[PDB]
Amino acid sequence: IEGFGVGTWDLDLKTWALDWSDTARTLLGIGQDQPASYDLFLSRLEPDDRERVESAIKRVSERGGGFDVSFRVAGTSNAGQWIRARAGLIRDEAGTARHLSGIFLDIDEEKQVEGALRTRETHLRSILHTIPDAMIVIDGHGIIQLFSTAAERLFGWSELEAIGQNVNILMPEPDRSRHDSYISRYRTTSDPHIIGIGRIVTGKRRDGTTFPMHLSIGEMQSGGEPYFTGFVRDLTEHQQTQARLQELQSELV
Amino acid sequence: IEGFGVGTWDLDLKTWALDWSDTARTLLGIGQDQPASYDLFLSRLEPDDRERVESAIKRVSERGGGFDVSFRVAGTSNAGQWIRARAGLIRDEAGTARHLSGIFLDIDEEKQVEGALRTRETHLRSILHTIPDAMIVIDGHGIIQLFSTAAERLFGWSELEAIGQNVNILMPEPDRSRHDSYISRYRTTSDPHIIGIGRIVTGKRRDGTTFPMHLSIGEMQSGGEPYFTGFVRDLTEHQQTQARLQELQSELV
Ligand code: HEM
Ligand code: HEM
Ligand SMILES: [C-]#N
Numbered sequence: 223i224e225g226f227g228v229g230t231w232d233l234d235l236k237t238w239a240l241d242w243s244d245t246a247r248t249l250l251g252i253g254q255d256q257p258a259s260y261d262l263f264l265s266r267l268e269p270d271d272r273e274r275v276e277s278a279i280k281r282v283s284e285r286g287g288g289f290d291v292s293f294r295v296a297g298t299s300n301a302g303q304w305i306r307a308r309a310g311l312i313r314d315e316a317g318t319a320r321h322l323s324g325i326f327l328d329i330d331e332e333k334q335v336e337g338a339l340r341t342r343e344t345h346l347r348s349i350l351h352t353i354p355d356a357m358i359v360i361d362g363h364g365i366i367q368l369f370s371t372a373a374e375r376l377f378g379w380s381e382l383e384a385i386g387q388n389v390n391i392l393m394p395e396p397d398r399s400r401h402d403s404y405i406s407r408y409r410t411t412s413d414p415h416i417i418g419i420g421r422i423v424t425g426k427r428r429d430g431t432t433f434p435m436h437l438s439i440g441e442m443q444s445g446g447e448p449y450f451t452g453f454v455r456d457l458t459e460h461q462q463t464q465a466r467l468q469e470l471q472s473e474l475v
Numbered sequence: 476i477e478g479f480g481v482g483t484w485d486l487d488l489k490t491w492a493l494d495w496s497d498t499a500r501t502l503l504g505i506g507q508d509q510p511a512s513y514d515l516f517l518s519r520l521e522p523d524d525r526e527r528v529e530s531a532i533k534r535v536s537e538r539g540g541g542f543d544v545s546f547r548v549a550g551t552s553n554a555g556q557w558i559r560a561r562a563g564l565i566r567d568e569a570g571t572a573r574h575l576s577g578i579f580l581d582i583d584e585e586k587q588v589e590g591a592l593r594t595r596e597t598h599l600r601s602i603l604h605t606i607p608d609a610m611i612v613i614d615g616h617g618i619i620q621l622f623s624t625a626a627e628r629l630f631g632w633s634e635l636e637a638i639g640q641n642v643n644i645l646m647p648e649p650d651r652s653r654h655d656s657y658i659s660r661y662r663t664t665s666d667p668h669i670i671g672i673g674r675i676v677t678g679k680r681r682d683g684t685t686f687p688m689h690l691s692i693g694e695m696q697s698g699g700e701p702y703f704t705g706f707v708r709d710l711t712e713h714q715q716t717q718a719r720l721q722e723l724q725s726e727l728v
């Protein structure tokens with residue numbers, strides 16, 4: 223084999239011989255000189271990972287549903303080469319299991335993407351828990367997707383209650399009945415409305431109590447659908463104080 | 476082979492004959508009785524990917540460092556299946572490679588993860604550009620990781636100027652020289668929900684001017700290190716209307 227970025231390997235169930243290709247030994251961090259061995263292989267694997275490999279080899283000898291295990295050999299320094307081993311059985315004319323044959327795949331890119339996603343989700347939960355303004359995310363038909371802690375305290379809905387509801391549950395009439403059409407008309411666009419301007423509206427808690435609020439939308443695209451992130455600033459204290467200011471001034475005459 | 480979960484295929488450059496695994500037939504969504512053929516393979520690809528596959532076989536036909544391209548096949552309607560095709564060259568006895576041979580991998584999970592990360596990154600840029608409050612993310616040593624649009628407007632640094640700088644560039648003395656010690660003193664504390672307490676500090680613009688500000692922090696853990704997300708609110712206008720309210724409340728008392 224030449225230029226195959228995949229390694230290959232074969233483990234006879236009868237003679238316990240293991241042979242692998244040249245790219246296979248480089249992936250394991252094994253030299254030229256070192257001969258192929260079932261025990262050299264289990265030595266490149268940190269302890270618990272060995273148990274998973276051998277338990278999987280015995281299970282593939284039994285029921286025989288394939289072999290798929292992934293592991294990190296300490297191949298370089300201490301960050302390692304992630305590898306996914308895949309294999310299936312070879313039988314003889316009698317149909318006894320004889321050879322376990324398959325591949326080693328480099329999966330360092332796949333594990334890097336997997337952990338970049340994990341960090342993103344952990345950061346999203348952190349923003350959702352922590353942002354002082356209510357943050358609401360909706361899809362292109364107004365259905366709430368994400369709902370921050372500040373939004374739960376402001377609107378009286380838990381995020382499990384809110385998610386999957388229309389965002390219109392947060393609104394008094396008439397905006398409540400019209401909000402789907404405000405979104406639909408923007409989705410026709412030609413930019414008559416700008417999403418970024420910001421506006422003061424009235425929202426209402428699950429109470430039925432209403433309150434002034436300012437909010438800001440940002441738009442994003444994903445998977446052929448728009449999504450909108452809203453940040454809500456309660457203005458009850460802001461308008462109690464400016465009211466007291468105007469009153470005091472006009473009274474001092 | 477048996478429960479390999481991977482298809483194998485061997486195409487000859489010279490005879491254009493193709494043999495695929497039985498497991499590879501299910502991946503292409505067709506072939507219950509119809510024999511393998513190179514024309515039938517390109518028939519399952521969309522006529523944008525089949526152009527890419529032909530360029531890839533030509534590329535490896537003349538000095539190719541392997542063969543590695545991925546594509547979505549329709550499989551069956553509403554059942555598109557992403558797969559990754561990998562292959563290498565193999566020689567006869569002395570001359571140019573007889574047959575180009577390799578594997579078909581099911582990569583539906585890999586591309587769900589890739590798309591989920593892509594959605595997360597798009598959302599973070601949207602949040603960063605839309606959020607009204609200055610959002611700043613630092614690592615365990617106070618190095619700025621992220622810097623939102625409102626942060627650049629408020630502090631006077633671009634994100635490209637800010638990222639990789641210590642967060643203490645945003646503060647005056649004495650806090651500027653002590654902020655690193657605040658972070659390390661906190662990291663050897665282990666009590667949760669002390670970062671959750673807000674505080675009123677003074678910030679410093681790159682301008683050199685100072686302003687009162689409130690901010691709130693959330694911790695997260697990733698990769699062995701903490702990260703902190705600050706939400707900064709300018710209090711300049713809040714403290715001056717609150718001062719002109721209660722000094723116009725003392726015109727009579
Ligand atoms: C809960 C209180 C809310 C109220 C009372 C409200 C009200 C409104 C109004 C009055 C308009 C259009 C005004 C006009 O064209 O005459 C509008 C548009 C829109 N709103 Fe809301 N809204 C609320 C929350 C939200 C949230 C939280 C989001 C997104 C996360 C959102 C997304 C949109 C979109 C996409 C549009 C169409 C484009 C635009 O004009 O900005 N709304 N909304
Ligand atoms: C912009 C100007 C800032 C100033 C003037 C400032 C000031 C301070 C002060 C005075 C303390 C310690 C209070 C005490 O010891 O009693 C502190 C602690 C801390 N700061 Fe900042 N800070 C600023 C921005 C930030 C930002 C944006 C973040 C994070 C993204 C941050 C992260 C921390 C952390 C993690 C601590 C320790 C946790 C705590 O006890 O509060 N700082 N900062
Ligand atoms: C919605 N504004």
Ligand SMILES: [C-]#N
Pocket residue numbers: 674676690
């Ligand atoms: C920083 N507080």
